[PDB]
Design a binder for this molecule. Sequence first.
Ligand code: B7Y
Ligand code: B7Y
Lengths: 302, 302
Amino acid sequence: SGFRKMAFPSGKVEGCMVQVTCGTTTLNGLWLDDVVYCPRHVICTSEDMLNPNYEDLLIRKSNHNFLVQAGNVQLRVIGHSMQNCVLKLKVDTANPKTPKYKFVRIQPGQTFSVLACYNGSPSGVYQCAMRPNFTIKGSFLNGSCGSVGFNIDYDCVSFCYMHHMELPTGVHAGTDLEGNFYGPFVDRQTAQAAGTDTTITVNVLAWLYAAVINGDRWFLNRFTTTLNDFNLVAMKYNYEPLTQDHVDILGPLSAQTGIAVLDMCASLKELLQNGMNGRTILGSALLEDEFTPFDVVRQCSG
Amino acid sequence: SGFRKMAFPSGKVEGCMVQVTCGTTTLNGLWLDDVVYCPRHVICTSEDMLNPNYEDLLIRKSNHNFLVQAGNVQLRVIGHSMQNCVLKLKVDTANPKTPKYKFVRIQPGQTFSVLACYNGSPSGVYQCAMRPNFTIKGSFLNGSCGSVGFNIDYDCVSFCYMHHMELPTGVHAGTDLEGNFYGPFVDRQTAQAAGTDTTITVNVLAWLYAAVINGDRWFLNRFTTTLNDFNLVAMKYNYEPLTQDHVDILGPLSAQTGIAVLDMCASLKELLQNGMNGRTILGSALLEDEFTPFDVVRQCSG
Ligand SMILES: *[C@@H](CCCl)C(=O)c1cccc(C(=O)N[C@H](C(=O)OC)C(C)C)c1
Ligand SMILES: *[C@@H](CCCl)C(=O)c1cccc(C(=O)N[C@H](C(=O)OC)C(C)C)c1
């Protein structure tokens, strides 16, 4: 019993974190086999941050301009290249702790664990969701760039996020491990801002099932609704549309609780229209949308 | 920016988790140097669960009755003993991954990371607080017994919790690493239940400071209060009394935000008396009390 925002165990990732310094700029890197991955803005300085041409900046560097430290061991850089917004530093040593891994790009509404790091040293681990507007609501301080987001499936680490910046609203933006940004953000100084966001409906319904599995039932009702009528309400409250595929994905949880998906949707409609009247669900007084159906099944199966 | 429930990186702990089987009962153990620690109820069977005499149960076992598996390696048990409600299994191999560690008992209102494990395999990591009534609101399924709670300070792991059981309300109880229960709970089948609980005031105030540091200011006011008047309100809302030591502990956060502790207490009094009028603080619609002053300083310093 119980329902917590749970992250994957971080040890496999911890053994990949290093510190990358170029000039007086330092940040974190990810050491896999004989390559270190980090944000390419490590080669930029305060003077070029407005319209930097990264191809020019990199052509003017050599391997000796990069210091890579893995704990108290200095790694010799033997090559450097750029891939989109990530820098690849070839080092002369393959990381002996490299896990089985994949570079996967995630979808908005999916969750992942973040290992916050500073100066190549892990500091904390927590769960995040990619928002519909392609930002993440992280916890990151100065020096956290290069920290990564990941999921683990049977000892294989699927890396999905590298941290690059903080937007003016305090939310965060970055890229996939191939250096391609999530969202319409760039690694330079502009007035860029998070676009409008929406609530991830399928996740809210998953979490209502979690709650039922954990004995919170007060929000249930005898009613049902059609998908079309439900989605009329969703649109009114800035919730994403629910699709038949979402209904199918919720099938297992529906079957375990005996509550049809469109029945739980009737409950969600009532909650949106009426609030909670002072009650809580799984210890929250608002509707939580950063648990996927998979997250719920993982933590609630028993 | 940002504020998340953040756990410590779990890798140091992950390398200590093993599986312990006695008969058909299996659970998790903690392998440090050449000792494996686990709940002593692993030696109990369904027939004895009402009034087990553990001294009798253990005298009837030998080393060969315990199977310890560390990954795919079987560890040879060469001794067994009991210490309060934990079993100590001496094995013939010192864990090469043993971190620097301490066994420390924590106070109600303090937080710690939990590494949930099944069959000696880590599954997830999350933050918990020891409640004033000595329970924890965890996330644990069948097979999670023997999972541990810990804090990490400069590479030294302070273990503070081993998981033993789930109470009827779905909250959790266990012991310290010396096998002494937190709270008035026992490792046998009774009608035992969590006692009345209260909210951890000093932590709520810490979190209000976190919020101010992260730009949530709407709940601030021009008022102050005395400690005595504040505590009259606290008692009315089932909040713990605030002490001068709590005020002193909040000194740094007060100084960073420029908001005197008793000023923030005036804000808390208004929030308790009036609710939030539909607003949120750090993405919550209720007052959060599972962050200590230390947790806030760790995550907000920048
Ligand atoms: C980024 C963490 C943000 Cl939450 C981080 O650790 C970091 C390290 C080093 C340098 C920067 C940085 O800000 N670089 C500039 C920038 O602001 O990005 C747009 C450059 C000069 C464009 C960040
Ligand atoms: C406990 C996890 C609870 Cl959230 C766990 O993994 C476990 C493993 C093996 C056996 C038990 C168990 O329940 N034992 C009995 C009990 O219910 O504890 C009071 C014994 C027989 C007293 C739990």
